[PDB]
Design an enzyme around this catalytic site. Sequence first.
Site, PDB file in Angstrom:
ATOM      1  N   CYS A 106       0.818  -1.209   0.000  1.00 59.12           N
ATOM      2  CA  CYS A 106       0.000   0.000   0.000  1.00 59.12           C
ATOM      3  C   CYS A 106       0.846   1.251   0.000  1.00 59.12           C
ATOM      4  CB  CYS A 106      -0.951   0.029   1.223  1.00 59.12           C
ATOM      5  SG  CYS A 106      -1.964   1.529   1.236  1.00 59.12           S
ATOM      6  N   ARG A 109       0.026   4.516   2.808  1.00 60.55           N
ATOM      7  CA  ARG A 109       0.135   4.345   4.248  1.00 60.55           C
ATOM      8  C   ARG A 109       0.534   5.579   5.070  1.00 60.55           C
ATOM      9  NH1 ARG A 109       3.749  -0.739   4.769  1.00 60.55           N
ATOM     10  NH2 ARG A 109       4.341  -0.271   2.565  1.00 60.55           N
ATOM     11  N   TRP A 278      -8.983   6.409  -1.116  1.00 59.81           N
ATOM     12  CA  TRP A 278      -9.258   7.183  -2.326  1.00 59.81           C
ATOM     13  C   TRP A 278      -8.224   6.759  -3.374  1.00 59.81           C
ATOM     14  CZ3 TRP A 278      -8.073  10.117   2.238  1.00 59.81           C
ATOM     15  CH2 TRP A 278      -6.727  10.501   2.352  1.00 59.81           C
ATOM     16  N   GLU A 283      -4.485   3.889 -11.038  1.00 54.58           N
ATOM     17  CA  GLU A 283      -5.295   2.703 -10.839  1.00 54.58           C
ATOM     18  C   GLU A 283      -6.417   2.665 -11.886  1.00 54.58           C
ATOM     19  OE1 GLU A 283      -6.016   1.519  -6.500  1.00 54.58           O
ATOM     20  OE2 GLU A 283      -5.574   3.692  -6.190  1.00 54.58           O
TER      21      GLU A 283
HETATM   22  C1  HEM Z   1      -6.134   6.673   1.654  1.00 54.61           C
HETATM   23  C2  HEM Z   1      -5.759   6.503   0.389  1.00 54.61           C
HETATM   24  C3  HEM Z   1      -5.177   5.179  -0.143  1.00 54.61           C
HETATM   25  C4  HEM Z   1      -4.435   5.098  -1.236  1.00 54.61           C
HETATM   26  C5  HEM Z   1      -4.008   6.270  -2.157  1.00 54.61           C
HETATM   27  C6  HEM Z   1      -4.108   3.709  -1.433  1.00 54.61           C
HETATM   28  C7  HEM Z   1      -3.356   3.206  -2.459  1.00 54.61           C
HETATM   29  C8  HEM Z   1      -3.135   1.881  -2.753  1.00 54.61           C
HETATM   30  C9  HEM Z   1      -2.582   1.397  -4.004  1.00 54.61           C
HETATM   31  C10 HEM Z   1      -2.211   2.301  -5.205  1.00 54.61           C
HETATM   32  C11 HEM Z   1      -2.491   0.071  -3.910  1.00 54.61           C
HETATM   33  C12 HEM Z   1      -1.967  -0.914  -4.988  1.00 54.61           C
HETATM   34  C13 HEM Z   1      -3.107  -1.928  -5.155  1.00 54.61           C
HETATM   35  C14 HEM Z   1      -3.634  -1.883  -6.548  1.00 54.61           C
HETATM   36  O1  HEM Z   1      -2.991  -1.200  -7.402  1.00 54.61           O
HETATM   37  O2  HEM Z   1      -4.649  -2.580  -6.771  1.00 54.61           O
HETATM   38  C15 HEM Z   1      -2.982  -0.330  -2.600  1.00 54.61           C
HETATM   39  C16 HEM Z   1      -3.062  -1.615  -2.106  1.00 54.61           C
HETATM   40  C17 HEM Z   1      -3.497  -1.938  -0.840  1.00 54.61           C
HETATM   41  N1  HEM Z   1      -3.988  -1.071   0.123  1.00 54.61           N
HETATM   42 FE1  HEM Z   1      -3.973   1.043   0.073  1.00 54.61          FE
HETATM   43  N2  HEM Z   1      -4.635   2.963  -0.409  1.00 54.61           N
HETATM   44  C18 HEM Z   1      -5.336   3.831   0.392  1.00 54.61           C
HETATM   45  C19 HEM Z   1      -6.041   3.433   1.503  1.00 54.61           C
HETATM   46  C20 HEM Z   1      -5.988   2.187   2.103  1.00 54.61           C
HETATM   47  C21 HEM Z   1      -6.659   1.826   3.325  1.00 54.61           C
HETATM   48  C22 HEM Z   1      -7.576   2.791   4.140  1.00 54.61           C
HETATM   49  C23 HEM Z   1      -6.349   0.544   3.573  1.00 54.61           C
HETATM   50  C24 HEM Z   1      -6.791  -0.308   4.769  1.00 54.61           C
HETATM   51  C25 HEM Z   1      -7.613   0.217   5.682  1.00 54.61           C
HETATM   52  C26 HEM Z   1      -5.478   0.058   2.524  1.00 54.61           C
HETATM   53  C27 HEM Z   1      -4.906  -1.199   2.417  1.00 54.61           C
HETATM   54  C28 HEM Z   1      -4.363  -1.769   1.284  1.00 54.61           C
HETATM   55  C29 HEM Z   1      -4.064  -3.169   1.116  1.00 54.61           C
HETATM   56  C30 HEM Z   1      -4.256  -4.335   2.109  1.00 54.61           C
HETATM   57  C31 HEM Z   1      -3.489  -3.260  -0.288  1.00 54.61           C
HETATM   58  C32 HEM Z   1      -3.065  -4.527  -1.029  1.00 54.61           C
HETATM   59  C33 HEM Z   1      -4.419  -4.877  -1.672  1.00 54.61           C
HETATM   60  C34 HEM Z   1      -4.393  -6.165  -2.447  1.00 54.61           C
HETATM   61  O3  HEM Z   1      -3.553  -7.053  -2.124  1.00 54.61           O
HETATM   62  O4  HEM Z   1      -5.181  -6.271  -3.425  1.00 54.61           O
HETATM   63  N3  HEM Z   1      -5.307   1.082   1.643  1.00 54.61           N
HETATM   64  N4  HEM Z   1      -3.370   0.805  -1.915  1.00 54.61           N
HETATM   65  C1  LIG Z   2      -4.883 -12.141  -7.311  1.00 53.97           C
HETATM   66  C2  LIG Z   2      -4.970 -10.899  -6.456  1.00 53.97           C
HETATM   67  C3  LIG Z   2      -4.253 -10.800  -5.254  1.00 53.97           C
HETATM   68  C4  LIG Z   2      -4.368  -9.633  -4.484  1.00 53.97           C
HETATM   69  N1  LIG Z   2      -3.686  -9.533  -3.316  1.00 53.97           N
HETATM   70  N2  LIG Z   2      -5.161  -8.606  -4.914  1.00 53.97           N
HETATM   71  C5  LIG Z   2      -5.863  -8.684  -6.085  1.00 53.97           C
HETATM   72  C6  LIG Z   2      -6.720  -7.515  -6.562  1.00 53.97           C
HETATM   73  C7  LIG Z   2      -5.963  -6.755  -7.687  1.00 53.97           C
HETATM   74  C8  LIG Z   2      -4.613  -6.196  -7.234  1.00 53.97           C
HETATM   75  N3  LIG Z   2      -4.471  -4.910  -7.923  1.00 53.97           N
HETATM   76  C9  LIG Z   2      -5.527  -4.722  -8.901  1.00 53.97           C
HETATM   77  C10 LIG Z   2      -6.653  -5.513  -8.252  1.00 53.97           C
HETATM   78  N4  LIG Z   2      -7.167  -4.690  -7.169  1.00 53.97           N
HETATM   79  C11 LIG Z   2      -7.931  -3.537  -7.575  1.00 53.97           C
HETATM   80  C12 LIG Z   2      -8.242  -2.512  -6.485  1.00 53.97           C
HETATM   81  N5  LIG Z   2      -7.307  -2.408  -5.386  1.00 53.97           N
HETATM   82  C13 LIG Z   2      -7.292  -1.106  -4.771  1.00 53.97           C
HETATM   83  C14 LIG Z   2      -6.454  -1.027  -3.500  1.00 53.97           C
HETATM   84  C15 LIG Z   2      -6.872   0.270  -2.847  1.00 53.97           C
HETATM   85  C16 LIG Z   2      -6.556   1.501  -3.435  1.00 53.97           C
HETATM   86  C17 LIG Z   2      -6.930   2.705  -2.864  1.00 53.97           C
HETATM   87  C18 LIG Z   2      -7.666   2.658  -1.696  1.00 53.97           C
HETATM   88  C19 LIG Z   2      -8.018   1.436  -1.121  1.00 53.97           C
HETATM   89  F1  LIG Z   2      -8.721   1.413   0.024  1.00 53.97           F
HETATM   90  C20 LIG Z   2      -7.621   0.239  -1.690  1.00 53.97           C
HETATM   91  C21 LIG Z   2      -5.782  -9.839  -6.867  1.00 53.97           C
END
Ligand code: HEM
Ligand SMILES: Cc1cc(N)nc(C[C@@H]2CNC[C@@H]2NCCNCCc2cccc(F)c2)c1
Lengths: 407, 410
Positions: A106, A109, A278, A283
């Site tokens: 993330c 953070r 947000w 993305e």
């Molecule tokens: C506040 C603004 C936030 C931004 C700009 C942000 C941004 C991102 C981005 C760019 C990713 C890469 C995942 C992707 O491209 O699909 C990500 C993944 C992730 N974020 Fe953040 N996030 C935010 C808030 C949060 C919050 C509030 C949480 C938890 C409460 C969180 C937990 C996670 C987790 C666990 C992942 C890995 C998700 C996965 O494995 O699919 N994020 N986030």
């Molecule tokens: C296979 C697999 C594993 C894994 N850990 N995960 C996935 C979802 C995929 C990861 N990457 C594209 C898609 N997830 C799409 C949306 N993820 C947004 C994370 C995010 C962003 C901003 C604020 C938030 F609260 C959360 C698939």
Amino acid sequence: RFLKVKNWETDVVLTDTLHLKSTLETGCTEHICMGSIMLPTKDQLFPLAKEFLDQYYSSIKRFGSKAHMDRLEEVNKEIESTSTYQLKDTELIYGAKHAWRNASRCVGRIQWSKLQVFDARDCTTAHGMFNYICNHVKYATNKGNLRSAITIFPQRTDGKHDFRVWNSQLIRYAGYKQPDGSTLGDPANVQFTEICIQQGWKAPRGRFDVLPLLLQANGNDPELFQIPPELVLEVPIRHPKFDWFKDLGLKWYGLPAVSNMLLEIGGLEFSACPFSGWYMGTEIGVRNYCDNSRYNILEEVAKKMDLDMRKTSSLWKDQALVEINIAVLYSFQSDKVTIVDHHSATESFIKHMENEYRCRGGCPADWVWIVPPMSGSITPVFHQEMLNYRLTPSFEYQPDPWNTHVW
Amino acid sequence: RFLKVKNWETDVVLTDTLHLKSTLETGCTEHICMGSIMLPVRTKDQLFPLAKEFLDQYYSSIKRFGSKAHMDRLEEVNKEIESTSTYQLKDTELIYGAKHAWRNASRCVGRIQWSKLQVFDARDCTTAHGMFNYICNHVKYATNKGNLRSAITIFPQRTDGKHDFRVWNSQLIRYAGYKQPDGSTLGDPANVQFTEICIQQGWKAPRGRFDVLPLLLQANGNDPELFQIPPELVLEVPIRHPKFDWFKDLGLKWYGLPAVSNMLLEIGGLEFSACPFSGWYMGTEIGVRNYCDNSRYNILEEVAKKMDLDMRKTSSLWKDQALVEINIAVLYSFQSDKVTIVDHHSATESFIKHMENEYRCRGGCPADWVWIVPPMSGSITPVFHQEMLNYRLTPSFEYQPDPWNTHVWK
Ligand code: HEM
Ligand SMILES: Cc1cc(N)nc(C[C@@H]2CNC[C@@H]2NCCNCCc2cccc(F)c2)c1
Ligand code: HEM
Ligand SMILES: Cc1cc(N)nc(C[C@@H]2CNC[C@@H]2NCCNCCc2cccc(F)c2)c1
Ligand SMILES: C[C@H](O)[C@H](O)[C@H]1CNc2nc(N)[nH]c(=O)c2N1
Ligand SMILES: C[C@H](O)[C@H](O)[C@H]1CNc2nc(N)[nH]c(=O)c2N1
Ligand SMILES: [Zn+2]
């Protein structure tokens, strides 16, 4: 056993000590790096509980105090007698915030401590789940001024009574395969969209149909609910320079709200724990719009730009990519809906990383995911070495529930 | 064991068995992944095993495992080691060795080309002057008037580690860097230190923006010596833009031949500390990294200034726009001058094809995703969506530290 991390653009070197507190496995060995792979009892519970409560009491600076020992005793009593235990509200809020703090993938953070936790552990039905989720959606959206939130449903018991949100995100667009052979809407969601039909959803059959929620309470069969359309904030996409851009028919939703992950706190497992922040612009503009397996719009946009598509070396894909992402950002900004660009987000993550090294001894970070899917090396994270390791409390991916359910 | 990799764009799944022949260590553990860390005299004892392992691979590649030629060579090498404490590679083995070091290089997207490598055996070289001549010939052969050919020149191997051959340049052709008293840099900031050593060694510096550095060459553990590559051997390309006429007036150029000279080649447990090799550029190496890294030529601001972009906020993506234009210019300029170059779409697509072939015919293809994904437009290239497994095979190319850190001055 103490490790150094170097930034190659600034020469800044940081020492990681936090990694010695990891326990869970990476998937890597001494012989093989799996860094680019997306998926790499009563006796078991009390060490987990203890470990968590120790760090909690350390954080509120009451480590080894009577209240600490009392609580460790109380939880021990409750495990021995019930085979589980309940988190105090304070522990829940701390746990959720730290699960985010620990999410190595993330970029966002810096914001980890500003998280609104909604305690939905008193929920008993899918209808209750729906109400909690609408309230989450409205609170978080805040008329475009987005606020990070998580809603936490009851914890796993025997694992036959799981709470789950079947959607991967609270808000997503439907996908339909056509007699044509092509795909209408989001190809990512075709399978889920079919399951919604199979439970009775009436699909508008459009390119941007907001999916209904499929909510499972207490291990029961999931139920369909539509989010009130007035709660789902969307942004029509236009370009500040290109008049024709609007006519591509593009929009996205403002609230990214991940609903398929599992929150683990102190060995307790929260299988339904939708959270939201947000968007970072890429993305939507790079991944959702330009992945070949997604809305895949590069070809159509480049044509409207009158770029020469005859050879890859004209970088027509790259030019179109930039303009698409300029549009995404401009559209959100013009509509006063929180968005962050990849320059600003990664710069803030470097600042967060330096705070976490300074104040915590490290920050687990997954370079493969932290570096944006466009313009990698002109963002500061590209030149930043990162150590990836797994800390608890944590969020974990869990498989799509339809594979793993009986009806 | 069988390890699976998936491509998330195609759903193609591949099975890796080759990783079972991996010996060396990654830096990673079950508790920590060091996948983004840039840097994560032997005994007779260890040497024969390394030789045997290499010769077993070599002989099995030529379909002669177990043959009399195979058994005799093992015997010959064993005796040579026992008696002389080292051994000499046959020409056929050097060639095979050098090709496979390239084949095994995880961080190289260019590997579809591995079997077409011109090997120059410079093991009879004895002096820095001799090294200079070998290197000039390499440069001329590889350049081939713009029709670039991959090549490697291999100097004598390590003996006691006290008599190493080394090329002190990190690349055969690079531009000088000059730190000015006001804190600004003229030319390439990556080369300030090496430039200062050259100057100290007697190089008269032109003190301009694109001065090709002299070679600093160490033979047989002796103090290195300075040599100027003949300028008519150094092919360069002035950068211009197909649409933007002012782009030429930035005064940018780059050299055509990328030739890495600071790496160590290991074959059969023997160490070649001087083994400069060369291919051709992928555009982004120049247009993204060399031109746009803040620690390098850092031209984004000037380009976006000339494009009159809105520069007041990052969210306008002025940096991204200018980045694409600079890279168009690089590819255009090389193509117009008929100097071999490859764009990052073509390069990555060929790499996926290479990788898939390697799984079919070899059981795997170690690949370092961090390096393989290009430094612009990551996810619009097929490699972004491709899962990869990184592990170490020998023969191999290894980073070695800069020799001015270790060298004992005679
Ligand atoms: C506040 C603004 C936030 C931004 C700009 C942000 C941004 C991102 C981005 C760019 C990713 C890469 C995942 C992707 O491209 O699909 C990500 C993944 C992730 N974020 Fe953040 N996030 C935010 C808030 C949060 C919050 C509030 C949480 C938890 C409460 C969180 C937990 C996670 C987790 C666990 C992942 C890995 C998700 C996965 O494995 O699919 N994020 N986030
Ligand atoms: C296979 C697999 C594993 C894994 N850990 N995960 C996935 C979802 C995929 C990861 N990457 C594209 C898609 N997830 C799409 C949306 N993820 C947004 C994370 C995010 C962003 C901003 C604020 C938030 F609260 C959360 C698939
Ligand atoms: C023929 C065209 C080639 C292309 C387009 C190509 C492309 C690349 C690229 C883009 C990199 C990443 C390193 C960087 O970005 O600085 C790389 C690394 C590397 N390449 Fe290739 N390459 C080619 C030929 C060769 C040859 C002939 C060899 C050796 C015989 C080789 C061996 C290596 C090694 C050892 C690395 C890692 C370098 C390091 O750790 O600094 N490549 N190549
Ligand atoms: C610290 C460190 C470790 C390491 N292994 N390496 C380095 C050189 C860095 C890698 N990245 C930028 C710079 N090296 C730039 C030169 N890379 C050319 C690779 C290449 C391309 C085409 C044809 C060829 F024959 C070779 C530094
Ligand atoms: C195979 C590779 O790990 C995969 O495509 C990853 C790469 N980096 C990523 N980075 C982010 N932020 N999100 C992703 O979904 C991915 N996908
Ligand atoms: C810290 C990080 O590992 C480092 O900046 C790497 C990332 N990926 C790279 N990829 C290539 N091809 N070349 C590089 O120099 C780097 N640098
Ligand atoms: Zn690893």
